[PDB]
């Protein structure tokens, strides 16, 4: 399985992905990745890991809404099952990755701190 | 503390793909949610009874293995808020809708799939 | 979209700085504390009541009484610890929390200092 | 001027973990330095670094409590001696070094969305 992304472009304003800063260009690249790997049965494990690292930078820079948009972008592209070939069940494989590697990052960071106040108090007593 | 009468704007009525407001076509559900957000930002936010109805519908989508539809509606609401940010408008309604998005809607996304079963028929 | 009539609980009346005909800050603090504690169980306070309270906090700011806003801020914050500790009222917590973090705390960013200068 | 804190060591402060002990230490610090004209600037810097750890661990409400604790202790001007105007000096520190940390981190992201869009066009 070939690599679609270059690991050396990202360090390991909005964070860069694969040397791109414009969000529409990032989205366009992600669209290509999904579309070209469905026919191989899904993406390379390392490209997923590299993309997750970018998504986590988004989460930690108060840009969860950009993770949300990219997630739905990938999700909607998987509606193309009647148009694109898939070997090794690429559509199922991408949907697993979406549900297991990507979507769970939407709740990595909380935006309410009731559990934090509780944890500190439980540790205080 | 005392009781007061007031008139308030409501977008929804108190009374397989679950329906929302007696709508079956998801594109019609989407256009209805879009105008709900766009028209209530200027009010300072939506009516809590309308949010509760909408959240109940999202939970049904989750329970029906349609998380991808919740994801789409989540992003639909989010991009309506980008109109506020860009034009530097409606800060009160933005903040209320933002809290709904981040605390009431998005947590459902992490609370087999319906497409997967169709995907397995590979032709 | 349509108009509906309802009954809603209001904690304040629409008619140094006074709040709700109160001059003693201890009685103002007592009142705010009751307001948070009672409305937490409702899912949050009435936006008209928040507006009245915020304009009062503005008057404190505009009169160099930032330290009173800071005190009321923490008072509200510690009411929310009761929710956290007893894991209750999650809706009213989140609404009050947003008010604290977005409507109140931003106001914070020497009426005593003038009196401090008289050292005896 | 003497150092009240030890540079060599929820986030911990000065090897303390329970929040009431941290509050107790801060209360002592304020109270014992008022008579010196205010704290040592390096102790302020070390305390600021602890407050920033609180802010970045979603504990601004603990920054809020400590801020109000220091603020309220400055009401003690009729009871404690001060040289170099220690009460004024602490109040400046409160208003300039401590309280502005309460708004270091935003909890609404309208400006983030605007920034990204303005960068996009």
UniProtKB/Swiss-Prot annotation, chain B:
Question: Where does it live in the cell?
Answer: Nucleus; Mitochondrion
Signal peptide interval: none
Additional notes on this entry: Present with 521 molecules/cell in log phase SD medium.
Q: How does it assemble?
A: Interacts with REV7.
What is this protein's function? Answer: Deoxycytidyl transferase involved in DNA repair. Transfers a dCMP residue from dCTP to the 3'-end of a DNA primer in a template-dependent reaction. May assist in the first step in the bypass of abasic lesions by the insertion of a nucleotide opposite the lesion. Required for normal induction of mutations by physical and chemical agents. Involved in mitochondrial DNA mutagenesis.
Family under the similarity heading = Belongs to the DNA polymerase type-Y family.
Q: What is this protein called?
A: DNA repair protein REV1
**Could you tell me which species this protein originates from?**
Saccharomyces cerevisiae (strain ATCC 204508 / S288c)
Swiss-Prot record, chain C:
Where is the protein situated, by its record's location annotation?
Nucleus; Mitochondrion
Cysteine pairs forming cystine bridges in this chain are: none
User: What additional remark is attached to this entry?
Assistant: Present with 521 molecules/cell in log phase SD medium.
Q: Which family does it belong to?
A: Belongs to the DNA polymerase type-Y family.
Subunit structure of this chain's protein? Interacts with REV7.
* Main function: Deoxycytidyl transferase involved in DNA repair. Transfers a dCMP residue from dCTP to the 3'-end of a DNA primer in a template-dependent reaction. May assist in the first step in the bypass of abasic lesions by the insertion of a nucleotide opposite the lesion. Required for normal induction of mutations by physical and chemical agents. Involved in mitochondrial DNA mutagenesis.
**Record's protein name:** DNA repair protein REV1
């Amino acid at each position: 399985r070939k690599r679609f992304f270059n690991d050396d472009l990202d360090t390991s304003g909005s964070p860069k992905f694969q040397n791109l800063t414009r969000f529409k260009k990032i989205c366009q690249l992600v669209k290509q990745w999904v579309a070209e790997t469905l026919g191989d049965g899904g993406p390379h494990e390392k490209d997923v890991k590299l993309f997750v690292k970018y998504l986590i930078k988004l989460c930690d820079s108060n840009r969860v809404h950009l993770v949300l948009h990219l997630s739905n972008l990938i999700s909607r592209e998987l509606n193309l099952c009647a148009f694109l070939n898939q070997d090794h069940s690429g559509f199922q494989t991408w949907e697993r990755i979406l549900l297991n590697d990507i979507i769970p990052l939407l709740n990595r960071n909380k935006h309410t701190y009731q559990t934090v106040r509780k944890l500190d108090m439980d540790f205080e007593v």
